[PDB]
Amino acid sequence: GCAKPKPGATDGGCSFDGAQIALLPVADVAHIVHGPIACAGSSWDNRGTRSSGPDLYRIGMTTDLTENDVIMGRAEKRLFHAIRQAVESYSPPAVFVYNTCVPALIGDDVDAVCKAAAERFGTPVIPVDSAGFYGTKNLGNRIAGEAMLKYVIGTREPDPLPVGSERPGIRVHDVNLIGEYNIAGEFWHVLPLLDELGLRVLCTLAGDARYREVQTMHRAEVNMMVCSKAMLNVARKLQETYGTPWFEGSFYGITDTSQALRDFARLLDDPDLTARTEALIAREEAKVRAALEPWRARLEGKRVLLYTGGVKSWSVVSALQDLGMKVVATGTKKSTEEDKARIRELMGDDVKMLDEGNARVLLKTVDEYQADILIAGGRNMYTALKGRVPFLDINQEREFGYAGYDGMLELVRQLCITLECPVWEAV
Amino acid sequence: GCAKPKPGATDGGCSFDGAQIALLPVADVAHIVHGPIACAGSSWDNRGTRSSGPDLYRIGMTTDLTENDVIMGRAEKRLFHAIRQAVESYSPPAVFVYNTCVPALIGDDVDAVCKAAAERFGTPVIPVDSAGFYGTKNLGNRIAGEAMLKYVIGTREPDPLPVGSERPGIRVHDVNLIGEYNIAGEFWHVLPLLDELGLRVLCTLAGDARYREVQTMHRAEVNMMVCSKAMLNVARKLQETYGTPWFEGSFYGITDTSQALRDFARLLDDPDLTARTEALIAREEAKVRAALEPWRARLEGKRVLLYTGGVKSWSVVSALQDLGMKVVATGTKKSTEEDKARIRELMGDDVKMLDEGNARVLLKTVDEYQADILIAGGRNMYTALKGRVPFLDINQEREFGYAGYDGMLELVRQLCITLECPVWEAV
Amino acid sequence: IINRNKALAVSPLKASQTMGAALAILGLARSMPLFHGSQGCTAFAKVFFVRHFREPVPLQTTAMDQVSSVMGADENVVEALKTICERQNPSVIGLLTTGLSETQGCDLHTALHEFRTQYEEYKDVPIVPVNTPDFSGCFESGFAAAVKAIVETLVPERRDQVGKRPRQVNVLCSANLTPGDLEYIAESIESFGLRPLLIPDLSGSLDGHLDENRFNALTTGGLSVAELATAGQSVATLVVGQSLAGAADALAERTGVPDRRFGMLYGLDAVDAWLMALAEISGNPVPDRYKRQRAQLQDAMLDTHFMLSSARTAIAADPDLLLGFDALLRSMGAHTVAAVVPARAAALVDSPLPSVRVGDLEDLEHAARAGQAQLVIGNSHALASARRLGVPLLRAGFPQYDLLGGFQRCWSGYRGSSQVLFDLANLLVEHH
Amino acid sequence: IINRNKALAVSPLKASQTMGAALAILGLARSMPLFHGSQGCTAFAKVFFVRHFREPVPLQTTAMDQVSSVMGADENVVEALKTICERQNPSVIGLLTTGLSETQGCDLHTALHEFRTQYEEYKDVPIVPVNTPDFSGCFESGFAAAVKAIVETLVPERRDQVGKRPRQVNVLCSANLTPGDLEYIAESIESFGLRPLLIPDLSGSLDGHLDENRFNALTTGGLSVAELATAGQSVATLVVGQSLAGAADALAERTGVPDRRFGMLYGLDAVDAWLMALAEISGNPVPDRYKRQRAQLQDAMLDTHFMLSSARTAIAADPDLLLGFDALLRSMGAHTVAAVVPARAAALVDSPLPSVRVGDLEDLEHAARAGQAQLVIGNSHALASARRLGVPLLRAGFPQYDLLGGFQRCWSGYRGSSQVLFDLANLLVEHH
Numbered sequence A, B: 001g002c003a004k005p006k007p008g009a010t011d012g013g014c015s016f017d018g019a020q021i022a023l024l025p026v027a028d029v030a031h032i033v034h035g036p037i038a039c040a041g042s043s044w045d046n047r048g049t050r051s052s053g054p055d056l057y058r059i060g061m062t063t064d065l066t067e068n069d070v071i072m073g074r075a076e077k078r079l080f081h082a083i084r085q086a087v088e089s090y091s092p093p094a095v096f097v098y099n100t101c102v103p104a105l106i107g108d109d110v111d112a113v114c115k116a117a118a119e120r121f122g123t124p125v126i127p128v129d130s131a132g133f134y135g136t137k138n139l140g141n142r143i144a145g146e147a148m149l150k151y152v153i154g155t156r157e158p159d160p161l162p163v164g165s166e167r168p169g170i171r172v173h174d175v176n177l178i179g180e181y182n183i184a185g186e187f188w189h190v191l192p193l194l195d196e197l198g199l200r201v202l203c204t205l206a207g208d209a210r211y212r213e214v215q216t217m218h219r220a221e222v223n224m225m226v227c228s229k230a231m232l233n234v235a236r237k238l239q240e241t242y243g244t245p246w247f248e249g250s251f252y253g254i255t256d257t258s259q260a261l262r263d264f265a266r267l268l269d270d271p272d273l274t275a276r277t278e279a280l281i282a283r284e285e286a287k288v289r290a291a292l293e294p295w296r297a298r299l300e301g302k303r304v305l306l307y308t309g310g311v312k313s314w315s316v317v318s319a320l321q322d323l324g325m326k327v328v329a330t331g332t333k334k335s336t337e338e339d340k341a342r343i344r345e346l347m348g349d350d351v352k353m354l355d356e357g358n359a360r361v362l363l364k365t366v367d368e369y370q371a372d373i374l375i376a377g378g379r380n381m382y383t384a385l386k387g388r389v390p391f392l393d394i395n396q397e398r399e400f401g402y403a404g405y406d407g408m409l410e411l412v413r414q415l416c417i418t419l420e421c422p423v424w425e426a427v
Numbered sequence C, D: 001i002i003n004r005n006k007a008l009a010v011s012p013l014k015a016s017q018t019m020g021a022a023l024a025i026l027g028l029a030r031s032m033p034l035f036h037g038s039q040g041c042t043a044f045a046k047v048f049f050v051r052h053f054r055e056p057v058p059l060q061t062t063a064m065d066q067v068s069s070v071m072g073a074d075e076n077v078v079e080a081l082k083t084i085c086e087r088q089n090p091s092v093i094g095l096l097t098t099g100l101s102e103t104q105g106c107d108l109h110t111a112l113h114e115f116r117t118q119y120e121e122y123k124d125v126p127i128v129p130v131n132t133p134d135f136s137g138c139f140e141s142g143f144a145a146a147v148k149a150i151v152e153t154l155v156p157e158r159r160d161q162v163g164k165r166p167r168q169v170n171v172l173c174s175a176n177l178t179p180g181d182l183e184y185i186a187e188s189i190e191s192f193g194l195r196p197l198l199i200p201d202l203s204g205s206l207d208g209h210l211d212e213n214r215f216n217a218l219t220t221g222g223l224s225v226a227e228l229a230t231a232g233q234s235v236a237t238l239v240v241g242q243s244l245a246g247a248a249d250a251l252a253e254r255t256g257v258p259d260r261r262f263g264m265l266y267g268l269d270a271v272d273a274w275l276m277a278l279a280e281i282s283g284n285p286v287p288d289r290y291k292r293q294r295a296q297l298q299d300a301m302l303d304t305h306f307m308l309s310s311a312r313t314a315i316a317a318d319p320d321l322l323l324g325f326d327a328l329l330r331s332m333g334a335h336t337v338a339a340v341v342p343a344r345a346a347a348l349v350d351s352p353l354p355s356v357r358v359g360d361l362e363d364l365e366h367a368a369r370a371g372q373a374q375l376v377i378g379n380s381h382a383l384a385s386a387r388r389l390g391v392p393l394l395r396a397g398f399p400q401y402d403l404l405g406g407f408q409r410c411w412s413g414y415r416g417s418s419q420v421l422f423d424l425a426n427l428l429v430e431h432h
């Protein structure tokens, strides 16, 4: 689950952070943070997504609450004028106000201030209530889904497919990807496969997405949970409210990519889609397997320690699993039941109590199994580096690269670059 | 004149250097230096011209004579194969081979090797025979003109003016600019004036020039010597061989620019051109004078020491002269009769014997008159700087900028930048 | 004068007091900063710093709950102090208030007296308490405020007057001194035969500095409380950067050591006076080395004067760096056409600038565009502003996550100064 | 192995022997190089250098006439020596043969004995004679040959064996050591309590280094003949850069001082062994400073390993720099995919590269393209090659007229090395 013990595995970030991880990759929107600088300032350079157009989500926006403003009351005045500023200066399609510990405490009415602002100025303003102290990032991810109820609701109908018009295919198959964040532009590797099968994605939920894309989500024919289970709540609420079926898959590894595409085929039901999807997987497996053989000698048989940190990390396992590296995973008492249940299957009906111990447990735990690389996410990078151990970030946020068939092409490259690096013996 | 005294004012560079200064700004051509690396290597980064297209004159080319090649005879073999290389690899319109001390000494027959290469390969190869030891840069400048006799010779007729076609003007007035090197792209400041008056420039002799432009030079109606008197020999030989009249002027300063345009008007004779040229000068003087008044306070009354170093430097004097700065010029025994005769008019029927003394004479000579800046060309830059005196390069080669009406706009800016710099008091 | 406005901050220049106060404690050896606030506050600060120095950074959380509406956090602050003390056993701990915990007043001193009663924990583990709400001041002031607190918590008092013995020179370092600035400042001092006590010392804590596989609490630190104790006695104290006046005052009242303070160490005058004050403090003369570098700098001014004389620049930096870069540039004839600061800060009279703004990068872009910046000085956040003008960036300042070398650059002194002229010269030249 | 070809040189990588031999004399104090050749040869070499150091440079001309077909230049060489001697009165003069004068054989020694008879001029003004035809070898070999000549012309002989007294350590510097390399080499030595005699010393001659309004003959010089004379006696001689083996041999036969030579001082190993050889020569240990820097470098390797591990690079440099950069890069997992050199040069076995080419920039561009250079290290002349690939440049090497800071960069040692990793990392990162 999750609870928090002071200075013990106490790092993870608020629900606000969590909400902002999920809503920011909606590029053309204005993303106003309603707090003091602790909140905005830093999380702004940010991480991950790549846009193929608008870069508004890259502009740090925030009502910059001075102390006077919290000698209560002014907090609201500012926000109202902060939206007026966003709307006139940048004219966004829509505006998202994120709530924060200070303003939640002094009782700030985000919702009502937002609605007033919608009406007076004419730009949809969506309130995300997830100040940090509510809980963890996951919680903020979920609160981000909930708010997309007052915006997903077909506040708008699916565009008419473009006059382009792929012939003999039922180009009329609409779908959604929930939780794909086009991080490092990785999704650019999957989208062409979808397009080939004639699957129109109404919205990649926070992956090169635009506001007007989200509006139309209820008309999807099949929703798909991309790793993220933090948002099971949207797949289910869409299912229950519009009848739209769903599944879970990842786009990391040959197996999952093939499987994700496979159960697209059988969920929205067509024999032409189905025959074509086998043809596609046919072609791609052929391609990728062939391009990977030369590399098998080099990485094959290397031991990887694996650590989960909120990072959707069982996905990567699917990948390197098939290649042939022995994997050892572990969660930390403050793990989801997801992690621990998966850590279970993978190996040993015992440890996922690696405790709240940082490198202490972690480092020595690498040593224990004689692991070759540690894989875990940016937090645990410097414990790996300084403990003179090879490392490989679990972020699609980054500039690699790792999904679909062609993803693995640089996953492999990235593993060798580090675990064959002559710098390691030199320290 | 010129003669040379060992380690005394002994810097100036060969006739090869001189020839290369004159022929290099023919951009699309291949410019092969037939020598050892002393010759090419360095002079290659080069200086000055700006091209509006082809950058081949920027590629260092040279036959790279090893010692074996000068255990005579191979010298010629190489060159022949050197042209064959330039012609196949870069397909230039034409190719220019420059002669050099070592190859002139061992008797290398440039002319014949060139002609052989022309015929076998079909690309005009022009031989420039001006190895360093013949004399000075000026000499190399003159040898560069001579060689353009076997190429200027209408080896080609003037293009038909473009279907553009400026109406009511006798757009049919052809001219040449001999010795304008479009240095720092400065000529881009004059060309639009000429275009307005409907004077077509057949060729700016070595200023954004192309091979096929030079070919057509004999059909000019009026030739114009731009500062360079080192090339009086072409203006005259063109005049005597095709009857084409000429004059001398500079495009530095409001006066000369207006005067150069004026005697264009009265040389090729038209009352419409004439009335229009007054109109132009009318407009431009109005413009520039107006844009210069605000600066007059700042530079007015500053004393400039002026030194000639092969630099066409009496031109700049015309400029700052009108602005109001008191000018004191000086030449160095190894000066042309040009310099000394002009130094004469400017001031004092005595000194132009500043001797071969470097900073010794120079520095103290700046101090003598309490000069504010010294102006002389890149050689004397560091004697000025380190003698803690303001400086301003006499190169149009550079990235400023100084000709035509709009040129003075940054001459003034460049003067202030240095002689109002707080760095001077700090040393 | 200083201009301000309201009301939405667009791409903020400013970072929190409570982060800036956190890297001051980060410059004590074997230390551990502790935010009294919810966990995201620290998880954000942490990311900020590691992406800067690209090296791990220790930072923990009071972990205020949704019930930070009920029990102030008495329980939280206390269990945090007991937890760390017993888990990594710091040489020092930093107790920092956030915007959240300050919303009450948050019984700072008290919670610490609530963790100055129970205490099977030794005690003798010093604790620096700082008040630094996200909602006031800024990074730099934040930082300068944890130096006031560091000074006052550690040894200032009992001894005095007669506590001024050795040839030890105290240096009060400000926030925008990098390890490479700090090394210059220390090597510079040592070369006069003095011995620096740097307060505090990021040189010690932040680079690649260790030989254990794991370094838990910053052990690769700067100031040992041990040796900070001895700041009481010492010939003089040098104050580097105006942001630290209030700390030079605290330092100076509790001991008797006389301050000779001031500027960021940029430009001729700035380093001239630094060396002089050092020659005086120690009698012996300016080493031949810095005699030479002054000559090297003067020459760099002659060679770069063409390009920098009259350059329009726009600077988006903490007040100290502003004044430091303004001075440097003005010794070249460069005009700073646009200065944007995060918060009011001393450095009144504005320095010689007719004016400066508080209002961050959106303001910079438009102020820069107004007076025609040729060049913009600022942090990684400024790339975008610069790139959105048509203009070169020279980053300085304290978020630089996009530059491998940056956290470590020596800006200070004769070579530092001269290298900065090379860089502006080179940027200006190639974008022209 | 080393590949070559013919026949037209396109954008040459190479510069003349006779120029490189000219900056070695340029690193003696109060010296004046004299080309025996026509004037353009010097007027070119001058431009080259001043555009590099951006400071004045003394260089004169024998001034061979069209009549350099008749009287060899007897008269010319002699009148040139008498003229300078009597005009600026050098501490040393360099006599250097060009392509032109060598075309005869040019009675070098003789013309100098023709100016070792007449001589109302004192004499006692040493003269170094060097044979350096534009038509053989290259800049670096040029340079290493005027060091052999410098060594042999100045004091080597009479004394011996018993001439090896103090704790003075000789350093034979190669051509691609910048003043900032030489200062690191000198400060590095001095920090062990040794005292360096740098042979020769560009540190002294080339930066902004003077206080007279005019400096005629380089007075801001490196090596005093005065102090070069004392190289006879000295504990050991350190040889930096393989180009200097023939000079290490000359130096070593005439005195008895034992050499410990080699690499460009790049990377861990390179500097480890530099410091060790120093600890050994002097008994005392490696100062705490360089103990730290080695820790700093190792960290810069961990942080830049992501970007540099497996980078394709292409290098267009003198053989020394090649091997120096190759080593550094290989310690990172970087592949040098294309190495282009100006001339054969020792460093046979090629080092560990399967091969290297002599043939200059046109070759580099195509070799680079062949193996997919991601990055190109070279001089200002390489911009165009780099810009014509789609690729970043990091200049090093001896024409860099387009970069204000460059003639002066310290490449060497732990910080030098680490700063080079920051630079490649940063170029690689932003072009991706």
Ligand code: SF4
Pocket (backbone or CB within 6 Å): B013, B014, B016, B017, B035, B038, B039, B040, B099, B100, B101, B102, B130, B131, B132, B133, D037, D038, D039, D040, D041, D042, D044, D099, D100
């Ligand atoms: S022509 Fe003569 S002086 Fe001129 S660069 Fe060539 S060899 Fe040297």
Ligand code: SF4
Pocket (backbone or CB within 6 Å): A014, A016, A017, A035, A038, A039, A040, A099, A100, A101, A102, A130, A131, A132, A133, C038, C039, C040, C041, C042, C044, C100
């Ligand atoms: S923990 Fe609270 S105050 Fe801190 S960054 Fe998160 S929302 Fe903002």
